[PDB]
Amino acid sequence: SVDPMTYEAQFFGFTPQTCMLRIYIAFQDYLFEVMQAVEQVILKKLDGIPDCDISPVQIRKCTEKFLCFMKGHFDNLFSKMEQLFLQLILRIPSNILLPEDKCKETPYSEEDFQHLQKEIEQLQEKYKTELCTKQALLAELEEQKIVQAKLKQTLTFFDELHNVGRDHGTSDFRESLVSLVQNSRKLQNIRDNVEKESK
Amino acid sequence: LDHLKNGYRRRFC
Amino acid sequence: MDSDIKVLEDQFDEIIVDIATKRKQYPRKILECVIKTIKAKQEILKQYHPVVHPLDLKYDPDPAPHMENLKCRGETVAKEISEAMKSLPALIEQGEGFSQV
Amino acid sequence: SLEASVAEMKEYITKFSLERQTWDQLLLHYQQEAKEILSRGSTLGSSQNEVLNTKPDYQKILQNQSKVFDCMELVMDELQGSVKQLQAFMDESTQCFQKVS
Amino acid sequence: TISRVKLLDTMVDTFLQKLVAAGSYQRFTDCYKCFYQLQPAMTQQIYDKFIAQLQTSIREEISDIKEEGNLEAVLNALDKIVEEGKVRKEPAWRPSGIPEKDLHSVMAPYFLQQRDTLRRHVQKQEAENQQLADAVLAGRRQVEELQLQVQAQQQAWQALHREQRELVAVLRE
């Protein structure tokens, strides 16, 4: 029991039961209206009696009788008609989903949702590290240019040294040394022969 | 005359 | 009951239509807000793109004031051992010229 | 049973009360969140961490150059000594070989 | 379908048929016998006026509440929503009473597009970092091979020492 019809509201915006109450009090008021009409119409025609008179207090409770009958049948029939109203009108079939909340048709679970939030934060952090390591790599390469050019400078100095050796006659020192020790050895030998034939 | 039923509870058995 | 049930059912109807109004039109306003806040967050994220850490430092160059000085002494020793290699075998010829008579 | 029905209704009133309260709280939450994030803007385990952690010392490299040149300098000192030791011998050799008269 | 409006006019019509079934004029007179013995033409005339003004007053009432909040239009819109919604037949989602859950379901798509946008930004910067680091490794192998050539020619000039030592050995008595 006690159906609040929460989903039947939000669409209509009034709830069906309250609406049926308004309709009830209106219908009842109209029934009592036409009964008041017939009583005050028979009473004025009732003044057109000569010879004899018939009391109005009797006709009042006469109307009260017909009206109690009318409230029995009226009330019952309005209950049945009102339950038909709540069944086939003023009801979301429970099969139907409102266009207001279509995104809830495939609901995103609490766990998928929290998972996706954590993923979002952790991807913000991941972006934040990737950018500064971009800057770290780029900075290391710009720094690396300098040592590359300095080593090219020392290599330039060695090539310039072999150039300054090439000019002035001795491009390869090692060869010069091995020939100069060779002919130094010969000169030593022949020098000893000349000093030992010198006396 | 009134004396009409007032109420008609909306959501009850 | 009676009048009490009418007051209670009245406030109950009010809370039903109220919570239904919330259920309907609140997710749209909240959605508007969170769309603003998400655009704002992803916008302030890109403002961090200039991280710019300097790094750098270096041992700098100690250039070539003396580099040309040792290359110049290299010219000196180069020419010296060249002319020595040219003048020594002549002394070998003077050497074996005296080895017979 | 009127008692059971009015009971369920008097529980629903409080349930929907708590839900309305939660809706208002939540909505104003996202509201002031958007307000503060929109008013806030005005006023290292990354990919390839090995590449970042593998960083050879370049300063020590430039230092090693500065001492390489020193080694080279004493190399040419030893050379420039050996040359003198040689043509000293050449001079005494040519002198004693002209002493043959 | 009956467009929900012919259903309500139909059921209130049934309601009047059932009410007019009661007070079947016989029920009106047999309690109203006093005054019914006099002018049974007036009794039936006033009964007819009663039944007519009752049913037309009540029909004018429901037709008045059809124009109250465009109830014809909103019940017709509900007819449309019922027609388009048919083919599902399973119980649709209803507000479970937990604002956090329903708010999760509605806020989900924008957080998904947020996730995918940030993730493709991260993808871009990650690829550019792969290229940049590849260049960095290239540069460090270049400095490595450079220092290798430097020390190579360095030892090339250090090799003269042996030749000088054999010179001094030859030149020693």
Numbering used by the authors:
A (entry chain A): 2 to 200
B (entry chain P): 6 to 18
C (entry chain N): 104 to 204
D (entry chain D): 203 to 245, 260 to 317
E (entry chain B): 31 to 203
Which statements did the authors publish about this structure?
Kinetochores, multisubunit protein assemblies, connect chromosomes to spindle microtubules to promote chromosome segregation. The 10-subunit KMN assembly (comprising KNL1, MIS12, and NDC80 complexes, designated KNL1C, MIS12C, and NDC80C) binds microtubules and regulates mitotic checkpoint function through NDC80C and KNL1C, respectively. The 10-subunit KMN assembly consists of three complexes, the 4-subunit MIS12 complex (MIS12C), the 2-subunit KNL1 complex (KNL1C), and the 4-subunit NDC80 complex (NDC80C) (Bharadwaj et al., 2004, Cheeseman et al., 2004, De Wulf et al., 2003, Desai et al., 2003, Kline et al., 2006, McCleland et al., 2003, Nekrasov et al., 2003, Obuse et al., 2004, Pinsky et al., 2003, Westermann et al., 2003, Wigge and Kilmartin, 2001). Human MIS12C (also known as MIND complex or Mtw1 complex in Saccharomyces cerevisiae) contains the MIS12, PMF1, NSL1, and DSN1 subunits (synonyms are reported in Table S1A). Finally, MIS12C is a binding hub that connects the other two KMN complexes to CCAN through an interaction with CENP-C (Gascoigne et al., 2011, Hori et al., 2013, Hornung et al., 2011, Hornung et al., 2014, Liu et al., 2016, Maskell et al., 2010, Petrovic et al., 2010, Przewloka et al., 2011, Screpanti et al., 2011).
We speculated that the detachment of Head2 from the core of the MIS12C might, at least in part, explain our difficulties in obtaining well-ordered crystals of MIS12C. We therefore generated a deletion construct, referred to as MIS12CΔHead2 (i.e., lacking Head2). MIS12CΔHead2 retained CENP-C binding (see below) and readily crystallized with it in the absence of proteases. We determined the structure at 3.25 Å resolution as described in the STAR Methods. The Head1 and Stalk of MIS12CΔHead2 retain the overall organization and relative orientation observed in the crystal of complete MIS12C, except for a small rigid body movement of Head1 relatively to the stalk. In both complexes in the asymmetric unit of the MIS12CΔHead2:CENP-C1-71 crystals, clear electron density is only visible for residues 6–18 of CENP-C, whereas no density for the helical C-terminal segment is visible, probably due to crystal contacts involving MIS12C. A MIS12C construct lacking Head1 (MIS12CΔHead1) did not interact with CENP-C, while MIS12CΔHead2 bound CENP-C like MIS12CWT (even with higher affinity ). Indeed, the MIS12CΔHead2 construct, which also lacks Ser100DSN1 and Ser109DSN1, binds CENP-C in SEC experiments. Indeed, MIS12CΔHead2 bound FAMCENP-C1-21 in fluorescence polarization experiments with a Kd of 2.2 nM, i.e., almost 60-fold more tightly than MIS12CWT. We observed an equivalent increase in affinity with a shorter deletion mutant of MIS12C, which lacked only the 10-residue segment encompassing Ser100DSN1 and Ser109DSN1 (MIS12CDSN1Δ100–109). These results argue that segment 100–109 of DSN1 likely binds directly to the CENP-C binding site of MIS12C through an inter-subunit interaction, as depicted schematically in Figure 5C.
